[PDB]
C-alpha cells in the first residue's frame, strides 16, 4: 500500500476538495466524526482506502490532505463544516490577504512568505507514509492563489520529492462563472511554470459543468455547490482505482503510463455519463454518450483530432461482455482515429459499487455510470481559445502593470506565451 497526499489551493481547490472528501466518506462508510465501523482493524492498516486516509488509535480516519488559501474565509468553512471533525489544524493553512486575482502576487509576493510553511505541513504528512506515491493538486487556473501559488508549490515539490508523481485537477476559466478579467493571463502563466512539473493533469472547463448542470439537472443558474458535486463525482471516478481493490490505475505512476505517451501533452479529456436529475441507461447507451461533446468536461470535437490513449472506468452493474458489445457498435458508427504510433484500443476498469450521491443533492443515483479518460489532441481547442484571449489583451499590455508591480518582468508574459505556442504546435504535429 502506497499513500497519496491531496493538496487543495485557492477557493476553487478548497471547495472542490471539501466536496470530494465528503463523497469519499460516503463511499467508504466513514461518518463525519471520522469513525468507520466497517474497518475492523483499529489504528492502522494497509487497505486500499488507507491510501487516502490515515488512522488514529481512537479509530478516526483522517484525510491525507492539506488545504491552503491566502485568505481565511473559504477554509474557515472546512473547520466549521459537517466534516470539521476529520481534519486537524496543521492541515488547514490560511494567509492574511489573498492574491487579488494576480498570479504575480500569488507566486512572488505572498507565495514567498508562506511556501516554507506549506512545505513543513506537507512534510509532516509525508513523514507518516511508508511509501508515498505523490500528490494530487486541486486548483483554479484563474485565481491569483490557484494559479500563482500552485506553480510555486509544484516547483518546490519537484525539488523536495523528486521521484514522486504529481497529478492536477485544474479548473479552466469560463466567463459565465467569472471571477476576474485577467484569468487568461493567470492561466497561461501557471501552465507555463507548471508544465514540466506535472505528470498528468485533468482540466475541467466551468463552461461545460455549467451547461451540463443547466441541461441534465434543469438547474437554471448553477452555483459552485451544483458545479462541485458534479466535479466531485468525476474526480471520484478517477481516484476510485487508488482507493478500492482493483488492477487498473492502481498507483499514480500508472496514470502516466496509460494516458500520457508524450510528456508535455499530459491533459486527458474526461467524459462522464449518465447525469440525471433527482429510465435506466444501458452499458451501450452510457458508453455511446462518452463520445458526445455535450457530456465532456471540456467542450471540443474529438472527431477532429487523434487519440493517443483511452480508458473507460465503469461503476455499478457492468460486466465485460456488455462493454465489448457496446464498443463493437460505437467503433463502426463514430469517428475514432488513433495516432499511427499507438494501438487502437481501450483499457477498461469496472468497480461493482455503483456511484454514491450526496443525499438531497441534485444527482439521481443510477445503477451504472462511466468516466472515459481519452488523451485526444482535440483538447487543444481549449488552449487556442485561451491563447487568443491572452493575445487580444497583451497586444495592448492591458493590466500588465499589476503584474510588473509585484516584481514580475514583462518578459515572463511572452516567455509563457511562446511555450503555449509550442504546445499548440506539438498538438498539431499529432494531426
Amino acid at each position: 500500500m502506497r499513500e497519496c497526499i491531496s493538496i487543495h489551493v485557492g477557493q476553487a481547490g478548497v471547495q472542490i476538495g471539501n466536496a470530494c472528501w465528503e463523497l469519499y466518506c460516503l463511499e467508504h462508510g466513514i461518518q463525519p466524526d471520522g469513525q468507520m465501523p466497517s474497518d475492523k482493524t483499529i489504528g492502522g492498516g494497509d487497505d486500499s482506502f488507507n491510501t487516502f486516509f490515515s488512522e488514529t488509535g481512537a479509530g478516526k480516519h483522517v484525510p491525507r490532505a492539506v488545504f491552503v488559501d491566502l485568505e481565511p474565509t473559504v477554509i474557515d468553512e472546512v473547520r466549521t463544516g459537517t466534516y470539521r471533525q476529520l481534519f486537524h489544524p496543521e492541515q488547514l493553512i490560511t494567509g492574511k490577504e489573498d492574491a487579488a486575482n494576480n498570479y504575480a502576487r500569488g507566486h512572488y509576493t505572498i507565495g514567498k512568505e508562506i511556501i516554507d510553511l506549506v512545505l513543513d505541513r506537507i512534510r509532516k504528512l509525508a513523514d507518516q507514509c511508508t511509501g508515498l506515491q505523490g500528490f494530487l493538486v486541486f486548483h483554479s487556473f484563474g485565481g491569483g492563489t490557484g494559479s500563482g501559488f500552485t506553480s510555486l508549490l509544484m516547483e518546490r515539490l519537484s525539488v523536495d520529492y523528486g521521484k514522486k508523481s504529481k497529478l492536477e485537477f485544474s479548473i479552466y476559466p469560463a466567463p459565465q462563472v467569472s471571477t476576474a478579467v485577467v484569468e487568461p493571463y493567470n492561466s497561461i502563466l501557471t501552465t507555463h511554470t507548471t508544465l514540466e512539473h506535472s505528470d498528468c493533469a485533468f482540466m475541467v472547463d466551468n463552461e461545460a459543468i455549467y451547461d451540463i448542470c443547466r441541461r441534465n439537472l434543469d438547474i437554471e443558474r448553477p452555483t459552485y455547490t451544483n458545479l462541485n458535486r458534479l466535479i466531485s463525482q468525476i474526480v471520484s471516478s478517477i481516484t476510485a482505482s487508488l482507493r478500492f481493490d482493483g488492477a487498473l490505475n492502481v498507483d499514480l505512476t500508472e496514470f502516466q503510463t496509460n494516458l500520457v505517451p508524450y510528456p508535455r501533452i499530459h491533459f486527458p479529456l474526461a467524459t462522464y455519463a449518465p447525469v440525471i436529475s433527482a429510465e435506466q441507461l444501458s452499458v451501450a447507451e452510457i458508453t455511446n454518450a462518452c463520445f458526445e461533446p455535450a457530456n465532456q468536461m471540456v467542450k471540443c470535437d474529438p472527431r477532429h483530432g487523434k487519440y493517443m490513449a483511452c480508458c473507460l472506468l465503469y461503476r455499478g452493474d457492468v460486466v465485460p461482455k456488455d462493454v465489448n458489445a457496446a464498443i463493437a457498435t460505437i467503433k463502426t458508427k463514430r469517428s475514432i482515429q488513433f495516432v499511427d504510433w499507438c494501438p487502437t484500443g481501450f483499457k477498461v476498469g469496472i468497480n461493482y459499487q455503483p456511484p454514491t450521491v450526496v443525499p438531497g443533492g441534485d444527482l439521481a443515483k443510477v445503477q451504472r455510470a462511466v468516466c472515459m479518460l481519452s488523451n485526444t489532441t482535440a483538447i487543444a481547442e481549449a488552449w487556442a481559445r485561451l491563447d487568443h484571449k491572452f493575445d487580444l489583451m497583451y497586444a495592448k499590455r492591458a493590466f500588465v502593470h499589476w503584474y510588473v508591480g509585484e516584481g514580475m518582468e514583462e518578459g515572463e508574459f511572452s516567455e509563457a506565451r511562446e511555450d503555449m505556442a509550442a504546445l499548440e504546435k506539438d498538438y498539431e504535429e499529432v494531426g
Binding site: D301, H304, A380, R385, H388
Partner: protein, 281 residues
C-alpha cells in the same frame, strides 16, 4: 437584431448574402474580429471552428462544415470513396482513380482504350465517350448547387447549369430548360429521367457518407454549407461525378434566387425574422 461577421470578401456568393441580410434591417454587420456574432461567413482557409459556440447567450452559426474538405479535395475524395464501405471501390458513378501513394496499383490496370487524365489541387480515367451536344458536336459538364443546413437536410437547387465547350471534340452556359428541351427533341427523354435521378442519388450518397464525421447535431455551434457538384454525362446517359467544390460561385442569372434561398433555408431557419429547392432523403 441578429449580428454577423464577414471574413471572406472574395466570396461572390456571400457578398450577395450579406447584402440581402443588411437590406433586411434586422441584421447588423460587425467587425470581422468581433466575437459577439450570431453568424460567421467564414474564411476559406483555417477557419477557427474551435472558437465557436463558447459565447454565452449567442446561438452561433457558420457557413462551413468542419471536415467537409475530405469530400472537396481531389486526393482525399478518392481516398474517401475507396476506403468508405458506404461508397467502396465498387461504386458505378466514380471513375477509376489513384493518388500519388498508389503508383503500383495504377500500372496494374493501365497494362491492358487507356486514356487517362491527371489533376491536383490524383489520376483517373478520362471519359472517352462523352455525350455531345448538337449542333456543335461539343462537350459539357453539369454544375449542381446543393445546400446542407444545420439539421443536415440536403437541398438541391432546382436550377443547375451546363458548362459547354465551343469547340468540336451563350457564354458557354446552358440552363436546364433548354437542355431538357434538347433531350426531348434529340433523344426523346427528359432531364429528370435520364440524368437528375442519378445526380440526386450521387449527392445523397456522398453527403450521407460523411454525415457522422461532420454533423453538428449535438454540437455547441451549428454549421451549414453550399456545395458545387460537378458531373459528366456519357453517350449512354450515365452520370459520373467529377468533383465536389466547397466554395463555389454561381451563375449571374441565378445569384438573386439562390442567395435568397440560402437566407430562407440556412440562415432564417435558425435566426427567424418577423420553394426553389428539392429536399433529398
Amino acid at each position: 437584431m441578429y449580428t454577423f461577421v464577414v471574413r471572406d470578401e472574395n466570396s461572390s456568393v456571400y457578398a450577395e448574402v450579406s447584402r440581402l441580410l443588411l437590406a433586411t434591417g434586422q441584421w447588423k454587420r460587425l467587425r470581422k474580429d468581433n466575437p459577439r456574432f450570431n453568424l460567421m461567413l467564414g474564411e476559406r482557409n483555417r477557419l477557427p471552428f474551435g472558437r465557436l459556440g463558447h459565447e454565452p447567450g449567442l446561438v452561433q452559426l457558420v457557413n462551413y462544415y468542419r471536415g467537409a474538405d475530405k469530400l472537396c479535395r481531389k486526393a482525399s475524395l478518392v481516398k474517401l470513396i475507396k476506403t468508405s464501405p458506404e461508397l467502396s471501390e465498387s461504386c458505378t458513378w466514380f471513375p477509376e482513380s489513384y493518388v500519388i501513394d498508389e503508383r503500383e496499383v495504377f500500372l496494374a490496370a493501365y497494362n491492358r482504350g487507356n486514356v487517362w487524365i491527371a489533376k491536383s489541387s490524383v489520376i483517373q480515367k478520362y471519359l472517352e465517350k462523352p455525350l455531345l451536344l448538337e449542333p456543335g458536336h461539343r462537350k459539357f459538364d453539369i454544375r449542381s448547387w446543393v445546400l446542407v443546413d444545420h439539421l443536415y437536410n440536403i437541398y438541391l437547387y432546382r436550377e443547375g447549369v451546363l458548362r459547354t465547350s465551343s469547340e468540336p471534340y451563350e457564354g458557354n452556359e446552358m440552363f436546364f430548360e433548354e437542355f431538357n428541351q434538347y433531350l426531348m427533341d434529340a433523344l426523346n427523354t427528359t432531364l429528370e429521367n435520364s440524368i437528375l435521378l442519378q445526380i440526386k442519388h450521387i449527392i445523397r450518397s456522398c453527403l450521407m457518407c460523411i454525415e457522422p464525421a461532420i454533423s453538428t447535431k449535438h454540437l455547441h455551434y451549428q454549421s451549414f454549407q453550399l456545395f458545387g457538384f460537378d458531373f459528366m454525362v456519357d453517350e449512354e446517359l450515365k452520370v459520373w461525378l467529377i468533383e465536389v467544390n466547397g466554395a463555389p460561385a454561381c451563375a449571374q442569372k441565378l445569384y438573386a434566387e439562390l442567395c435568397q434561398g440560402i437566407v430562407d433555408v440556412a440562415i432564417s431557419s435558425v435566426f427567424p425574422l418577423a420553394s426553389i429547392f428539392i429536399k433529398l432523403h
